[PDB]
Amino acid sequence: FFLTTPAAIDLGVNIDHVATLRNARGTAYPDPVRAALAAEDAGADAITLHLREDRRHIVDADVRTLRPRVKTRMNLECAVTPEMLDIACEIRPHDACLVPEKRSELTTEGGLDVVGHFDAVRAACKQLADAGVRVSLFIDPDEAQIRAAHETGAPVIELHTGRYADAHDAAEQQREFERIATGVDAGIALGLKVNAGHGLHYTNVQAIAALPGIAELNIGHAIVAHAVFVGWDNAVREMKAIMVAARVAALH
Amino acid sequence: AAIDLGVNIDHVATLRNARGTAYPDPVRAALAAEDAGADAITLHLREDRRHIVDADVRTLRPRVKTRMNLECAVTPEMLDIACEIRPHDACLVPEKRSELTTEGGLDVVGHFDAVRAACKQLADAGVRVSLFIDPDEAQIRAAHETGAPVIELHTGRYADAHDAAEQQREFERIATGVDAGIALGLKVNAGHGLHYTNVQAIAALPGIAELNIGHAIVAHAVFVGWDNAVREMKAIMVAARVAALH
Amino acid sequence: AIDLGVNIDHVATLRNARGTAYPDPVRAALAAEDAGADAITLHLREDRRHIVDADVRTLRPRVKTRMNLECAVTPEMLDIACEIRPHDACLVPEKRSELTTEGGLDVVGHFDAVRAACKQLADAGVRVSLFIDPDEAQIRAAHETGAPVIELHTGRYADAHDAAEQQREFERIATGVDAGIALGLKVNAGHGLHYTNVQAIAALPGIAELNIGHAIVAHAVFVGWDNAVREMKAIMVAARVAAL
Amino acid sequence: AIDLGVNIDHVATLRNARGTAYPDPVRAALAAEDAGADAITLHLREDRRHIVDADVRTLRPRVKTRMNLECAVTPEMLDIACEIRPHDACLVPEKRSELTTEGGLDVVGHFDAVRAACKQLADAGVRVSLFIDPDEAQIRAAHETGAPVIELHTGRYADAHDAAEQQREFERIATGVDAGIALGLKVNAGHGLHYTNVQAIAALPGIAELNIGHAIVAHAVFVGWDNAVREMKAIMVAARVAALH
Ligand SMILES: CC(=O)[C@@H](O)[C@H](O)COP(=O)(O)O
Ligand SMILES: CC(=O)[C@@H](O)[C@H](O)COP(=O)(O)O
């Protein structure tokens, strides 16, 4: 027996692709800012948005307008460059996730190469922390990178669920799932909080939300994709409900 | 499908009957529920025709793309209508106070012969029969003795529970009642009073074949739209079931 | 501009059929306002068949727009209305002795009662409306009561069995609107209106507000409440603006 | 009484962002028909920026209403349009050398090319619309090409920065319609129209069909696709019918 309760597993909603849609036409709509606040009303525990150097989807006005309006938590994804880090320390989001943008900054799987850029990342982690931001590193589920993330001082890691999501068949999906599971264990063993989310959708998130060690799933595209047919409030509420049901039933 | 959802459409008819027009149309509701993931449509032709009326059942029966579950009382008029229509499934429910226990399930012990004969009459018309009963040892045992292959447990007290403690105690009656029915070779269903925050623990029980759910879906549908309400409930149950199996 | 009043009564109907708190008429009202409703309407019946007293009391201080309280001409219900101080009250017939055969309030027949109820609600700062048939004599009686608003019974128009009958019943409403506006009355409508018969009524310039209930709930079950309300509002505004 | 063409380009825009099959432009198309759309519109661009050949090829046999294919006046795409045999085609500018400063197809300037294209498509049984500005010189030339339909560029109306500018531009669209009907053309519109500016355009009795794209997808994100389509149609019908009576 158990009580269902929303605190069991947090959902971060990524609003980037609402921006993709708005930028397509050039008007202010559909508004990413309204998207974020409506997601909070629908049960999102944080709002996630990636301010790219090249400002391809989310733009600066989106971040600056939304920051003071946020009811829950802002999770600002950004690159490890001095100028973006300055923006992050000025805006003071509750959380930040350091993500690679330039190819020299990522691995072949797609996570931050914390190993190869160790000093720069440890410094970023320090200044963000000095400005009161809880820092996460978006990394591959590779034990060396996880260990390296822990050495940087970052309290959080976000594991890259892309290969899990894009698995070609069930045998390959299970293998990638095991990489994630053992990534979570190694991260927890070092006292890191561990998140996930990349590529997760309405039929592959359950197996991930059933992992007791995961704190928060940060989900973007799939929610927007489901919203077009179903409506934003419902797409959010539904993904949250599925996550919570998987989490709780797997615990007891 | 890891677990089946039957969507009950009675309270769509409640809305319709309040106005006297054909809208909102229960028949549309039922076919759309199937399109959004329902494995069966449940409907209760009461003797007093309070919500669902005969024409709703007759129109729906040849259209249904999954399974029809007809709820009805144990009386000749209704049983004969059921045998004429030949739904895939029927669930015998009480409509008179003399037919129900205080908990509100069918009093199979007190009306054993009438119920056992009903079971025979429907089984002859090719209908899979279920008895709507309390999670009560005596009633479960009696149900097995009627020859009906299915029971649906009355999850009302569980659903209506006020505290964590009271709901825990009622949950274990249901869990116990599932184990008992399975041990006698019955399929066990549930669903009365189940909604979007109490369905998960019941779906987590692997012995439950199908949850037949009504008012919670229609109530949520008002705000969220019917396709979404059904889909979401199905998603939550499957997530609960499969996560608990592994 | 044309106003939509959303009647939440049949949300309460769905709730009372199971005995839980859901669907919550209070939440339905507050979300109708978010979706564009200009007022919320609810009929506290003497027999509390759908909406109940706790519904009206809980919602009243939360209203961001206007509350239109439908109730009968009896002292208890008038006492409750004067205590709640809704923005609007619409006096409706409940007893068979208060009904015309068409179904509106017999204001001619209960003039003194209705006038006193008007004075009583007006003293409590409530803008009073009388639900009536599109009948010139009732419209006149309505005006003599001192009520500033009338709501015309569009149910015959709504339930017309064919186009000829529907057009004649439309002409009656149109004439009623002219008659009521010629006396200084605000005129409302809405009984039985839905998504393919509201347009013609919305197109009449003299209509201030359409108070619509069951059609929005029936649509919302498939479409969602927010959508159903916003859509009715948009259709109404489309019709009105194009008509001018 | 008035038709709604639902343009599905920006559903694909959303799909290509991620590189999976979702959200599926084909599903959107079919669900729009169920919601009341009279036609499905898609622009197969020469660079394939949103809609791709698979979308158009897979959607075509499944279309229950009619397909309106937007494509450019060049052999490759015209040859494709003839393969697909959509019910309607709308010729539109894609290169800087084919469009006016306002953004319409420079029909007067590419007359021989457009006339040939109208011939080729009509001989494949496709009914041809030309996307043009509401300028008399271009409407007259459109008629000269043999094309039975024109679609007026409502973008300047839609982008108007004040009430006065919006009246001026509205008058251009209105007189553009008169001028087109006078030559026996069917006249459409659609570019830039949304849920608070479509009404004045829908009130014009001469307008056959509104082809609307981005406003619906943008609304759909919050309210759901079926609802955004149905609601656009109902506002169009409401405004049209009330304008007639
Ligand atoms: C489908 C719909 O939109 C409903 O509103 C319905 O078709 C009419 O409602 P009535 O029940 O009021 O006739
Ligand atoms: C305001 C709204 O909800 C959108 O539906 C609107 O369509 C915006 O349209 P634009 O794409 O024209 O800004």
Numbering used by the authors:
A (entry chain A): 3 to 254
B (entry chain D): 9 to 254
C (entry chain F): 10 to 253
D (entry chain G): 10 to 254
Paste lines from the article.
Here we report a functional and structural genomics effort that applied saturation-level transposon mutagenesis and next generation sequencing (Tn-seq) to identify essential genes in B. thailandensis, followed by high-throughput structure determination. We used an “ortholog rescue” approach to maximize structural coverage of these gene families, which are likely to be essential not only in B. thailandensis, but also in related, but more virulent, Burkholderia species, such as B. pseudomallei. Using only seven Burkholderia species to select orthologs of essential genes, we solved structures for 49/406 essential gene families, and for 56 total Burkholderia protein targets (including seven ortholog replicates). Of these 56 targets, 25 satisfied criteria for being a potential antimicrobial drug target.
One strategy that has been employed to improve success rates is to “rescue” such proteins by adding orthologs from related species to the pipeline, based on the assumptions that many of these will have slightly different physical properties that may improve their solubility or crystallization, and that close orthologs will have structures sufficiently similar to the original target to be useful as surrogates in drug design. By using an ortholog rescue strategy for insoluble or difficult to crystallize targets, we increased our structural coverage of B. thailandensis essential genes from 31/406 (7.6%) to 49/406 (12.1%).
